[PDB]
Amino acid sequence: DRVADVIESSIGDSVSRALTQALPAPTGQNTQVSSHRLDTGEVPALQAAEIGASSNTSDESMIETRCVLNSHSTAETTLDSFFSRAGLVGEIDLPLEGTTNPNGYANWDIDITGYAQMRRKVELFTYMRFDAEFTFVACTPTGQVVPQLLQYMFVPPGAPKPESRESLAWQTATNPSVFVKLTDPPAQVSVPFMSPASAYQWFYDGYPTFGEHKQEKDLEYGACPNNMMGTFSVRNVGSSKSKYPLVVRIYMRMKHVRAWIPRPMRNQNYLFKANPNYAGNSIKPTGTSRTAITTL
């Protein structure tokens, strides 16, 4: 009734065959007693790195070990323990006089790739899914706390970005906004995972649009819109110039973190936001160097 290669066919299997399983490991593995072993045929110490797998040799087979009941916790190395720590990811200036946002408002493009510490950590993984907690610390350039009322507004991509302090966009009929005084403790808020993808990508090896990819448009290489969450806008809630110069530091704490595919950790200094460019004339070694290989 039906061709055999179609019946016995396996095209369509949606379940991923996994060769490994995640086991409970709340503490470091214990060490078991070991005695001398003088025999042929069994060679724990000999490996073959070509295979691409790490050595499975254990302490017990290399030396005579005692019994150690290891009760050291492995909890502080979970993804949440590692990433759930607020760090600086943005900094906005609202000076009185200058060429940088001198009209009492600013539009910060949401990108946590502007600061090395936070950036290097997250770039340890290729993909990451998480909720976050944003905290906004505001004050003057001297650290002085001033009696000023500010308005922070999240402008998702597509919404109208304010063009002035008195822009109509500040009506926030739908965008989420926060009104705080610099005298109040830093505003804090919870953000969900808002990407149209299943996770954010710190690395996107491709282009966002089709067509010819000429020199002028190489600016778009590695730009993934699934990571472009919109803009963060700030302003003096008023219609006149503020009496003080302001600064807003943005901190981010990740929660409910999932991460996939680890990568080599940043080796060279960061230069730009949208890419991994490095100074070709100042390529420094990963670490420290010495005089001779036979001397410390």
Binding site: A22, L23, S61, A75, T78, P192, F193
Partner: protein
């Protein structure tokens, strides 16, 4: 009850969190299950071999 909109919804891992709002992505990070899968990166070989054996036979 409460909205199930946290980033870890439908994950094969248990969490103990605290919350005061209807949206669960606002909950604390909480504590989590300590499962690990070293072999996934350290021994992703098709035909596994013992440590007592000579890798290449």
């Amino acid at each position: 009850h409460e909205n199930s909109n946290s980033a870890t919804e439908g994950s094969t891992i248990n969490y103990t969190t605290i919350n005061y709002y209807k949206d669960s992505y606002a909950a604390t990070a909480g504590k989590q299950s300590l499962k690990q899968d070293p072999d996934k990166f350290a021994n992703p070989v098709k035909d596994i071999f013992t440590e007592m054996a000579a890798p290449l036979k």
